[PDB]
Ligand binder design. Structure first.
Ligand SMILES: CC(C)C[C@@H](C=O)NC(=O)[C@H](CC(C)C)NC(=O)[C@H](CC(C)C)NC(=O)OCc1ccccc1
Lengths: 69, 239, 92, 49, 48, 195, 240, 230
């Protein structure tokens, strides 16, 4: 509600997707999605901006060594 | 955690193996990167060859090694360690013909090479070996096959694989390319492999630096591409 | 070499004026030799630039003597292709 | 780019609603970007740091 | 962190995060942590 | 049973019969005595089927490792030396006589005869087996220095054919192989060269 | 660093310190220079006389691995003599089983494997000596290889092992090794050793020169006396 | 000084190194085993780190004998070593007694192999946990062998990340009079609870041991069960 938002983005689609997203992680997805719009000079955050940040936030293993499964 | 299993191959709180994890880092200590790309009917290995001094033979310094007529590998890691693995892989491939009456499947060479590595981790009195091996060969009923093994003993089949200092970025370029639906022909696979090194390193290397080894369905033998052939591909991709 | 590049420019400028278009194609290997040459990496680049400058005159010919704006696009990609063989880290 | 957008227009960041990023980390090899370029940024923004 | 002296600097870094956002942010001043000097980088700090 | 090798300037012509015999029974009327030890090296085997099959397979494995290890085509002299070392070491155990004939770039087409003792001799023409005793005269009579591959192919087919007729052990089909820089051409003569 | 003590233990970054400590001892040793001329490979060692009581030829740093192959060693001599024996054995077995004189490329790979094995096991320290192998064959031509204490072997048109490896390599690059005749090359080797001798710091030194080539008919004989004397004269005049 | 060796007793309780091995088993891909009235169904989460890794190469659910199958949670290299040894012991039993090894006996023999590594010395214990399944004696059998060498039988069990969440899910939905097909649905559901992503035919590998043998389900078959709910 604080950010301008696309006004066409469906926030529910991101919520329906699973993953162990903490409150801090959810804050990162929203803040990064707004930041990505600022980087591309868009005053209104866009649906595509949310997905890229969402993937960035779900870094998950990120590194790891494959063995240790 | 650190200060626990740092000096021995023993378990740590959280079940982490420090000495084996350090071995993956030693592959990067080599300072070289390799990329391997599978194709509709082709498997291509590309590596960067750095000649440190003019007074050194380009032919002698090769990280592309044939293991069997139909099987070739690229070794990334400490040079001595890479060569020891090559002798073991050649011996195991030869035994497979000697004890089973047929040539080793590329999948089977990896399991045998990985199993030797795993034993070194479980039992002490051995350094894990600072090298990673990528094996390319054509298997009837499996198509061209690209396979990779790790110091830990992990082995896997990869549509495209990279190793060395730039592995993470190289895989990232490969991920975008692989995501594209189009399959890659011999020209495209040589191009994708060379471009992957080019984008990751930004060298725009001359024909001498890149060493390319290719195995094809039409010519099953592993062939080390000559410098002239390497240049012809390098000029064409630039257009 | 700088003397060779000046000779190349002088030799083909007359030929280019006489020829409809093939002479630019004829001087393209000379451009390749200069792109390959890295002995100076500066004067050799200017000789390549002189060849590109003759290519710009050929584009003026392409708009006028040849069909207007037909081969200029092909030459523009070709000049980019000449740069492609030796990018030199986007320098020189 | 990251520093200039809030510095030129904090209100534009406020319209987006994202807090302007407080800081960025110049991780780099020591001396080459640590001994030098530490105060070069001050000239880039044209102010003492 | 140590018996004689603990990670006071790490506590200061957490305090710095609190100072950077909310209580002390005005005049569009950027508190850039442009330093490769710290051996350890806080993961929470890395968060956007 | 009957095995023979002749060395022309550019290669070697190797031939043998097709009979494996237990007593007076023929176990196989169509036996390939000649076996490829490597791409351009072949060995014709006489003596005990089991002992010959084993030593040949063992040498093929050792030579293959040596060639990949050295990244060079294998010399015939090494291939003969690998067969000789095994035969001499296991002389009492094995009952095999082998003719190792192959083309090597360094020394050209060459024929090496390892008798059952494990001795090794390089010979312009070598004949071996039960039938060899019968054709010793024809071999040292019709051999002329500088015979062409076609002449050598005719000589082997004729000499093996004459021995096969005399020796009960040797009979059936004549298997002929010519090894050269180009490679190996294998022909089966269905008992031709009748005299 | 704590992790430096065992050859079996990798450092956290991913390197083995024990292998590195072996190389530094090789660096402390007097330089040995080898140049691959088209007709064979010529080896010279800056052997350092000590005490003067020791008779000439004592503590030789040049050894014959096989009649064709020859070796120059820089580092602890005792480790080198052991390596020479391992190589002499490998050459012995090769002629013994394969029937033909060992290809230099294969002998170098085998001796390197023995050096490599020492690095992976805690009980044995990694070898502390670096050696180079040179031989001449009609089939393979002249061949030169250098093996480091970590068991890494690669071909070199010219190579130097010891304190002055970098200084000597710069001098070696100037020589036209690809087409130079070996008899001329021997004189150049004497000069390169004399340039890197640092005689004031090293006091007395004795030059050892080894020759394998078409002139030597594929035998790694020591350069005949007088041929070395001329090379010594050429180097001394060039120095002044 | 304790917790660095398996050859020394804790100065009060038990050797810590075996417990650390259990920690590595806990850091593993989720594995769910559901014994059912007519069969045992075993499953694991197979997610490649990147799209490049081929999903048709190394297989997490691997047959050990015609009627016996194994699944693992823990370090992947260690699993292959015990997958080979378990298969070999099954063959040695066939040669000695001309009968396929009973599932209970195989677990005991596999457990003895795991215990040997836990024995004193440089050797470190296996970091894998196993879920042997069988249809021997006309009765479905599901068993677990831990790195320590203890063996237990589970009506349903989970190992690897979120074992507790899976076990609690199993407590709520597992009955006893359920056919293997119903058991397949429950096994897929438990993995879904701990699945960080959308399960796909490639993502989940499921293996069944009915009264016919242990057959890993074909990728197409796994997709049909993943589809239509579950
Ligand atoms: C290498 C062969 C192709 C040559 C072949 C010629 O027929 N030789 C033989 O076949 C020798 C006879 C030989 C001693 C005269 N006989 C055999 O190999 C036969 C096996 C048959 C099924 C083929 N008998 C056999 O091996 O068992 C008795 C024996 C065991 C060891 C040595 C010699 C004889």
């Amino acid at each position: 509600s604080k950010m301008n938002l696309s006004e066409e983005v469906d926030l529910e689609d991101y919520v329906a997707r699973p993953d162990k997203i903490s409150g801090a992680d959810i804050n990162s997805i929203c803040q990064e999605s707004g930041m990505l719009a600022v980087r591309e000079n868009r005053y209104i955050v866009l649906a595509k901006d949310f997905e890229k940040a969402y993937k960035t936030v779900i870094k998950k293993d990120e590194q790891e060594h494959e063995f240790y499964k | 955690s650190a200060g626990f299993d740092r000096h021995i191959t023993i378990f740590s709180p959280e079940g982490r193996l420090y000495q084996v994890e350090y071995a993956f880092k030693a592959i990067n200590q080599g300072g070289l990167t390799s990329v391997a790309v599978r194709g509709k009917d082709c498997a291509v290995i590309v590596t960067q060859k750095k000649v440190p001094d003019k007074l050194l033979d380009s032919s002698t310094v090769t990280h592309l090694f044939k293991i069997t007529e139909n099987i070739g590998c690229v070794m990334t890691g400490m040079t001595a360690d890479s060569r020891s693995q090559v002798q073991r892989a050649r011996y195991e491939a030869a035994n497979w013909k000697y004890k089973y009456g047929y040539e080793i499947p590329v999948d089977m060479l990896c399991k045998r090479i990985a199993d030797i590595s795993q034993v070194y981790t479980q039992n002490a009195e051995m350094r894990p070996l600072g090298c990673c091996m990528i094996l390319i060969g054509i298997d009837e009923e499996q198509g061209p096959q690209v396979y990779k093994c790790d110091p830990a003993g992990y082995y896997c089949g990869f549509k495209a694989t990279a190793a060395g200092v730039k592995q993470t970025e190289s895989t990232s370029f490969l991920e975008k390319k692989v995501k594209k639906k189009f399959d890659w022909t011999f020209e495209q696979t040589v191009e994708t492999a060379i471009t992957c090194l080019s984008t990751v390193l930004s060298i725009d290397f001359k024909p001498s630096e890149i060493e390319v080894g290719v195995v094809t369905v039409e010519n099953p033998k592993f062939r080390i591409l000559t410098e002239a052939e390497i240049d012809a591909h390098l000029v064409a991709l630039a257009e | 070499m700088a003397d060779g590049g000046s000779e190349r420019a002088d030799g083909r400028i007359v030929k280019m004026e006489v020829d409809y278009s093939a002479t630019v194609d004829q001087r393209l290997p000379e451009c390749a030799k200069l792109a390959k040459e890295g002995r100076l990496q500066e004067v050799i680049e200017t000789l390549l630039s002189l060849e590109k400058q003759t290519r710009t005159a050929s584009d003026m010919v392409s708009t006028s003597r040849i069909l207007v704006a037909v081969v200029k696009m092909c030459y523009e990609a070709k000049e980019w292709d000449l740069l492609n063989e030796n990018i030199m880290l986007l320098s020189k | 780019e990251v520093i200039e957008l809030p510095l030129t227009n904090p209100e534009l960041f406020q319209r987006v609603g994202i807090i302007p990023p407080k800081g960025c980390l110049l991780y780099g090899p020591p001396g080459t970007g640590k001994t030098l370029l530490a105060r070069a940024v001050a000239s880039q923004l044209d102010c003492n740091f | 962190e140590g018996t004689s002296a603990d990670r006071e600097i790490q506590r200061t870094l957490m305090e710095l995060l609190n100072q950077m956002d909310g209580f002390d942010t005005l005049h569009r001043v950027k508190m850039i942590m442009a330093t490769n000097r710290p051996d350890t980088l806080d993961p929470a700090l890395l968060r956007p | 049973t009957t095995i023979m090798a002749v060395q022309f300037d550019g290669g070697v012509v190797l031939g043998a019969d097709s009979r494996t015999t237990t007593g007076s029974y023929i176990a196989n009327r169509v036996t390939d005595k000649l076996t490829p030890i490597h791409d351009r090296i072949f060995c014709c085997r006489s003596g005990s089927a089991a002992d010959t099959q084993a030593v040949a397979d063992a040498v093929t494995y050792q030579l293959g490792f040596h060639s990949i290890e050295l990244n060079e085509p294998p010399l015939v002299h090494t291939a003969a030396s690998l067969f000789k070392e095994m035969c001499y070491r296991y002389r009492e155990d094995l009952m095999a006589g082998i003719i190792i004939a192959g083309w090597d770039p360094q020394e050209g087409g060459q024929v090496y005869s390892v008798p059952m003792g494990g001795m090794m001799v390089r010979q312009s023409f070598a004949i071996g087996g039960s039938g060899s005793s019968y054709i010793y005269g024809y071999v040292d009579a019709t051999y002329r220095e500088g015979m062409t591959k076609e002449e050598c192919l005719q000589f082997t087919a004729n000499a093996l054919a004459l021995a096969m007729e005399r020796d009960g052990s040797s009979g059936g089909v004549i298997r002929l192989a010519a090894i050269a820089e180009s490679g190996v051409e294998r022909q089966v003569l269905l008992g031709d060269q009748i005299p | 660093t704590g992790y430096d003590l065992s050859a079996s233990t990798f450092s956290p970054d991913g390197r083995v310190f024990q292998v590195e400590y072996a190389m530094k001892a090789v660096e402390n040793s007097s330089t040995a220079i080898g140049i691959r001329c088209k007709d064979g490979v010529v080896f010279g060692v800056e052997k350092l006389v000590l005490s003067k009581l020791y008779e000439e030829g004592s503590n030789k740093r040049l050894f014959n691995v096989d009649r064709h192959v020859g070796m120059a060693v820089a580092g602890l001599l005792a480790d080198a003599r052991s390596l020479a024996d391992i190589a002499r054995e490998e050459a012995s077995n090769f002629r013994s089983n394969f029937g033909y004189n060992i290809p230099l490329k294969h002998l170098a790979d085998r001796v390197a494997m023995y050096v490599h094995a020492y690095t992976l096991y805690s009980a044995v320290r990694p070898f502390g000596c670096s050696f180079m192998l040179g031989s001449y064959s009609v089939n393979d031509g002249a061949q030169l290889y250098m093996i480091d204490p970590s068991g890494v072997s690669y071909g070199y048109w010219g190579c130097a092992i010891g304190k002055a490896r970098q200084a000597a390599k710069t001098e070696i690059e100037k020589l036209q090794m690809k087409e130079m005749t070996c008899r001329d090359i021997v004189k150049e080797v004497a000069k390169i050793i004399y340039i890197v001798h640092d005689e004031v710091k090293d006091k007395a030194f004795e030059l050892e020169l080894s020759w394998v080539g078409e002139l030597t008919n594929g035998r790694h004989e020591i350069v005949p006396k007088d041929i070395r004397e001329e090379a010594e004269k050429y180097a001394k005049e060039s120095l002044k | 000084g304790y917790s660095f060796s398996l050859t020394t007793f804790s100065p009060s309780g038990k050797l810590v190194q075996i417990e650390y091995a259990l920690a590595a088993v806990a850091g593993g891909a989720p594995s769910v085993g559901i014994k059912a009235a007519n069969g045992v169904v075993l499953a694991t989460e197979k997610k490649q780190k990147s799209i490049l890794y081929d999903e048709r190469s190394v297989h997490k659910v691997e047959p050990i004998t015609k009627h016996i199958g194994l699944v693992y949670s823990g370090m992947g290299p260690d699993y292959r070593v015990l997958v080979h040894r378990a298969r070999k012991l099954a063959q040695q039993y066939y040669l000695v007694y001309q009968e396929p090894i009973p599932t209970a006996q195989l677990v005991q023999r596999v457990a003895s192999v795991m215990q040997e590594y836990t024995q004193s010395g440089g050797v470190r214990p296996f970091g894998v946990s196993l879920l042997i399944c069988g249809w021997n004696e006309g009765r479905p059998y599901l068993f677990q062998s831990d790195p320590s060498g203890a063996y237990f039988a589970w009506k349903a069990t989970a190992m690897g990340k979120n074992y507790v969440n899976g076990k609690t899910f199993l407590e709520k939905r597992y009955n006893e009079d359920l056919e293997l097909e119903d058991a397949i649905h429950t096994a897929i559901l438990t993995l879904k609870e701990s699945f960080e992503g959308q399960m796909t035919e490639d993502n989940i590998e499921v293996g069944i041991c009915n009264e016919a043998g242990f057959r890993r389900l074909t990728p197409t078959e796994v997709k049909d069960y993943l589809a239509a709910i579950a």
